[PDB]
Structures are given as C-alpha cells and as structure tokens.
Amino acid sequence: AGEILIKGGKVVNEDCSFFSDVHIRGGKIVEVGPDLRVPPGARVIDATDRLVIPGGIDTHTHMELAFMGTRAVDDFHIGTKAALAGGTTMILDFVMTQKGQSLLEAYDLWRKTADPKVCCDYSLHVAVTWWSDEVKDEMRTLAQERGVNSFKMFMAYKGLFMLRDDELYAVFSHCKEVGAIAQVHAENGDLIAEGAKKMLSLGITGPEGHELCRPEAVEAEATQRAITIASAVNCPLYVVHVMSKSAADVVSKARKDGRVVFGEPIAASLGTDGTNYWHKDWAHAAQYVMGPPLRPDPSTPGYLMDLLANDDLTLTGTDNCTFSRCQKALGKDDFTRIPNGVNGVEDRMSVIWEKGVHSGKMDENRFVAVTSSNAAKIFNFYPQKGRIAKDSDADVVIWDPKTTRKISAQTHHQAVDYNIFEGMECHGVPVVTVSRGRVVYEEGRLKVSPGQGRFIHRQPFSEFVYKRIRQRDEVGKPAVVIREP
Ligand SMILES: [Zn+2]
Ligand SMILES: [Zn+2]
Numbered sequence: 001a002g003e004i005l006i007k008g009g010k011v012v013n014e015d016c017s018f019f020s021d022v023h024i025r026g027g028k029i030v031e032v033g034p035d036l037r038v039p040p041g042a043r044v045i046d047a048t049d050r051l052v053i054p055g056g057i058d059t060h061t062h063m064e065l066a067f068m069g070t071r072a073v074d075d076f077h078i079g080t081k082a083a084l085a086g087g088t089t090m091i092l093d094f095v096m097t098q099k100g101q102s103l104l105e106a107y108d109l110w111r112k113t114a115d116p117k118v119c120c121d122y123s124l125h126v127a128v129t130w131w132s133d134e135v136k137d138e139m140r141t142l143a144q145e146r147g148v149n150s151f152k153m154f155m156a157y158k159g160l161f162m163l164r165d166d167e168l169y170a171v172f173s174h175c176k177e178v179g180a181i182a183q184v185h186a187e188n189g190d191l192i193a194e195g196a197k198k199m200l201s202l203g204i205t206g207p208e209g210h211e212l213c214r215p216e217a218v219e220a221e222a223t224q225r226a227i228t229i230a231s232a233v234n235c236p237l238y239v240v241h242v243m244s245k246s247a248a249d250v251v252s253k254a255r256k257d258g259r260v261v262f263g264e265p266i267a268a269s270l271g272t273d274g275t276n277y278w279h280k281d282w283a284h285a286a287q288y289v290m291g292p293p294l295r296p297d298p299s300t301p302g303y304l305m306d307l308l309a310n311d312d313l314t315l316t317g318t319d320n321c322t323f324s325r326c327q328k329a330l331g332k333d334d335f336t337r338i339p340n341g342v343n344g345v346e347d348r349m350s351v352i353w354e355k356g357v358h359s360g361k362m363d364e365n366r367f368v369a370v371t372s373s374n375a376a377k378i379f380n381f382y383p384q385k386g387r388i389a390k391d392s393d394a395d396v397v398i399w400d401p402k403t404t405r406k407i408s409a410q411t412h413h414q415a416v417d418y419n420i421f422e423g424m425e426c427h428g429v430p431v432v433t434v435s436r437g438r439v440v441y442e443e444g445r446l447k448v449s450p451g452q453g454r455f456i457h458r459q460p461f462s463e464f465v466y467k468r469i470r471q472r473d474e475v476g477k478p479a480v481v482i483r484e485p
Pocket of ligand 2: 060061062094240241319
C-alpha cells in the first residue's frame with residue numbers, strides 16, 4: 001500500500017547487476033529504470049551506495065514448532081520480524097504432520113497459527129510422516145488446491161517421522177504424480193538410534209555424544225540412498241540442511257550425473273561448525289545441537305560455501321528451530337533430550353554475504369540466486385519473488401555490502417537468548433527492508449504488524465523442477481527387446 005521510489009542504488013538480480021531506480025506501487029514493483037520521477041506523495045528510499053536486491057527467501061523454518069517435549073521460542077510473529085530485520089522477506093515453514101494425523105488437518109492448523117501472526121510472506125511445505133490411501137489423497141489435494149508443491153520425508157526419527165525405503169519409493173512416486181518436489185531429511189535413522197544408545201552407554205551424555213552418534217557418513221549414506229530411490233522413480237528430490245562435506249559431495253556427484261536433485265545447506269552449516277559440541281561449557285555446546293549435527297571438521301563451512309558458489313549446492317535456508325538456554329538445559333544429563341535446533345533466520349543474509357561474497361567465493365548475483373531466486377524457482381513463484389523486475393512483488397532489501405555488523409544475541413531480534421554466530425563480524429547489512437511494498441525495517445527499527453504477511457499459494461509442476469523430468473518420461477521409458485516369439 002502506498003508508493004515508494006528506491007533511488008540511486010544498484011539493482012542486483014541473479015543474472016546481472018545494473019544501476020536503476022525501482023518504483024513500487026501497491027505491493028508491486030511497477031517500474032525499474034534509471035532516473036525515475038518521484039510521483040507526488042511517494043516516499044524516496046535513498047539507495048546511493050547500496051545494492052537493491054530481492055528480499056531473502058528462507059526455504060527452511062520451523063517457527064513455534066512443538067518438538068522434543070517443548071516448543072520453539074521463535075514463533076511466527078517474532079520469527080518473521082527477525083527475518084525482516086535480517087533482510088529476509090519470506091519464510092517457508094514445515095507443517096510437521098504427526099504420524100497417523102491428517103495432512104489436511106496439520107496444514108489447516110499451521111495456516112490458522114501463522115496467518116494472523118506472520119509479518120512477512122510465507123508458504124508451507126507438508127511433511128509426509130506416514131503412508132496410506134488417505135495420505136495419498138491428501139497430498140493431491142494439498143498440491144492442487146492448497147498451494148503446496150513440496151512434501152518432506154524423513155529417513156531419521158525412527159518411531160516418530162521415519163519412513164522405510166519401500167515407503168519412500170511409494171511416496172516419491174506419488175510426489176512425481178502430483179507435480180511436487182520430494183524433500184528429504186537424509187540421515188540413517190537406524191544408525192542414529194543405535195549410535196545414541198551406544199554413546200549413552202559409554203557415559204558420553206554431552207553434546208559431543210550427539211555428533212559422535214551420527215557422524216557425517218550417516219548423513220552421506222541416507223543422502224545417496226534418497227537420490228537413488230528418487231532416481232528410480234524419476235521424482236525430483238530436494239535434500240534439506242546439508243551439513244557435511246561428504247553429503248554435499250553426494251549431491252554434487254548426483255547432479256553432475258544428471259540426477260534431478262537440489263541440495264540446501266543452511267546458515268548454520270555455512271557459518272559455523274561442530275567443534276562447538278566439544279566446548280568445555282555445556283550450555284554453549286548444547287546451543288549448536290540440531291539434526292543432522294554440525295561437523296567437527298573445520299573445513300566444512302568453507303567447503304559447503306564453495307559448493308554453493310559452484311551450484312553443487314543450489315540455495316539456502318536456516319532450519320530455524322530455536323530453543324532457549326533453559327529449554328536446551330532439558331538434556332543436561334542426556335544429549336538425546338536436548339531439543340534439536342539452532343537459530344539463523346535473522347542472520348542468514350549477512351552470514352552468507354560475509355562467508356560467501358566478501359570472501360571472494362561467489363559474486364553478488366550468485367548471492368541473490370542462493371538466497372532468493374532459486375527458492376522461488378524451485379517452489380514455483382519466480383519471478384513473482386526473487387527478482388527486481390516490473391510486476392514482481394515488492395519484497396526488496398537495500399543492502400550495504402561494505403559496512404559490517406557484529407552478530408550478537410544482545411542485539412538480535414530473535415526470541416532465543418543466544419546466537420550460534422555470536423560475535424561474528426559480517427560485511428553486508430540490510431539497511432532497509434520492504435515487504436509487500438511497505439517499509440517494514442529501517443534505521444534499525446521494525447515497523448510491521450502480525451498478520452501483515454500473506455500465505456503464498458503455489459501451483460505444482462514447477463518448470464525449473466519438472467521440465468527435464470517430463471522430457472525423460474517421454475524419451476527415457478525402458479523398452480522391451482523384440483524377440484522371435
Ligand atoms: Zn531435518
Ligand atoms: Zn528442518
């Protein structure tokens with residue numbers, strides 16, 4: 001609502017950067033070009049010496065998720081405010097369907113919880129945590145009527161969310177039928193379960209036990225297995241929260257081999273590492289506990305950033321699923337009871353800019369691709385989002401790439417009372433955030449109301465995801481050999 005001219009900045013899209021003003025009217029970008037006239041009444045945002053970029057799209061959040069006996073402290077309201085303050089203008093959150101629970105009920109429950117609270121736009125992925133004719137039907141309804149083209153399956157969480165290979169095969173085959181992308185939490189749940197039992201029996205109850213019970217081989221194995229099942233049914237696959245060099249190399253190899261798979265590292269795995277689980281201070285070490293775990297090889301985040309730069313890995317989320325210090329403390333005697341999840345929604349943009357662009361690993365245009373455009377392409381709303389262009393949504397960040405900010409829980413906007421990036425000096429600061437054509441963050445202050453954001457309804461068969469799948473259906477059908485009868 002209202003009129004904004006962003007003037008004097010350099011627009012940065014995934015394909016190129018160029019000086020131009022951006023005219024916003026009624027929630028949309030209505031013109032991009034040099035020296036645009038300021039209509040009477042329009043507010044001018046002076047973007048001199050700034051980049052004008054699509055707002056960040058966080059593909060992976062769990063706002064106020066009830067999980068492991070408690071509830072994430074960053075909710076849809078505070079979580080989306082913190083996203084905005086960090087230059088992120090859309091989140092995509094997981095409807096964590098309980099085993100045996102209607103996917104439509106869980107979807108409805110998420111929409112009712114988020115719709116009146118979100119401060120930025122959002123959409124939803126739906127977890128498929130069990131399988132039956134009903135789930136099958138509900139997935140079709142969700143894909144065709146409820147705006148969801150992404151379903152999330154777990155190979156870990158035995159007893160809770162885990163699906164076996166035969167069930168993944170059926171679920172993935174049905175994703176492909178409904179034009180959805182199959183997302184997978186890829187760790188071998190049987191090894192996690194055994195490993196945790198073994199670490200506890202050895203008296204390793206601390207957070208080091210959490211990483212040691214499921215080292216990167218456990219993630220690499222499940223990642224390859226999911227790729228292989230999805231390749232078998234020609235279903236596009238999306239591997240969420242790639243945490244390790246070996247799982248990332250699995251995704252890298254499969255893509256080079258032409259498999260339709262996408263890998264999503266998160267701010268945590270790009271900005272820090274798992275040496276923190278070995279910290280003498282139990283509270284500090286617990287802060288980093290999430291599944292899969294961050295990895296103790298300190299070369300990990302830089303390697304994941306190199307693969308993200310090279311498009312072995314294609315886009316980013318945060319897996320934001322926050323628990324306060326006193327919540328984490330529930331597992332002081334037993335790591336299996338530390339609620340799993342770290343922060344990142346607010347810091348993702350600056351973390352990636354500092355670790356990826358300022359470092360020389362990727363340019364500003366690849367930065368836009370891996371923080372917004374690719375999410376829009378995969379989840380099917382590009383160029384509505386992820387591009388500064390006429391007719392696109394006015395979710396726009398004015399970005400200062402030269403100034404640094406120090407990340408701290410003392411100054412962050414998340415509800416959690418610590419930050420895994422505590423102390424990190426990042427180049428790249430969101431100075432102004434515009435969401436739905438309104439200035440919602442400037443001069444370090446938020447100006448937004450819960451429920452101002454909107455659910456984004458997507459259609460299935462995202463072309464970025466499916467055009468190759470469909471062609472392979474047409475020319476890749478196996479053929480009988482013709483033999484004399
Ligand atoms: Zn997960
Ligand atoms: Zn997650």
